[PDB]
Homo-oligomer: A and B are copies of this chain.
């Protein structure tokens, strides 16, 4: 049961910090250049987390980075928190724009199954992925930092489109 600590580390280390300042950083980018107002976190339950989001789906294109967020943390001066903005194509048309990224601990969970010393078996990846997604959902429900500033996209994979899955959450948000 190591997915529980990873979910809390994901909140304590990442989301508790960037979410309060997130909507102010998006308004900064929009005024100089639109992008939706919340961060969309991808949660593939098969634990397949590609490093390059454009390879997962050609219709997901990188556009530009948000302004950086820096702070002194654990002895590191101005540790850099940056997020990438993606345009989601549909039938050759720009169907939306948002800040999109995977949940890094999912791949961190994936890599633990390879190492023998971790004691984490391959068969447990899906169960711990659901637990990570479920524990993260329970955290952000009571999290004061998250006031409708974050959206979690969880899915299981033989035809599938991540652009359509992301666009689904985008369209329903506009209502």
Contacts and interface: CB of A to CB of B under 8 A. Distances in A.
Interface of A: 1-6, 8-9, 12-13, 42, 49-53, 62, 65, 68, 71-80, 82-84, 86, 100-108, 111-112, 115, 117-120, 138-139, 142
A139 B76 CA distance: 23
Residue among A100, A112, A119, A139 with max Cβ neighbours from chain B (10 Å): A112
A84 B75 contact: yes
B104 A13 contact: yes
Nearest to A85: B77
A111 B72 contact: no
Contact of A102 (B5, B74, B102): B74
A82 B74 contact: no
A12 B108 contact: yes
Contacts of A76: 82-84, 101
B82 A78 contact: yes
Contacts of A13: 104, 108
A5 B8 contact: no
Nearest to A116: B142
Contact of A5 (B6, B71, B101): B6
A9 B8 contact: no
25 contacts: A1-B1, A2-B8, A3-B5, A4-B119, A5-B5, A6-B9, A8-B108, A8-B115, A8-B120, A9-B9, A9-B105, A12-B111, A13-B104, A51-B74, A51-B75, A65-B77, A65-B78, A74-B101, A74-B102, A74-B103, A75-B84, A75-B86, A75-B100, A76-B84, A117-B138
A151 B105 CA distance: 25
A115 to B, nearest CB: 7
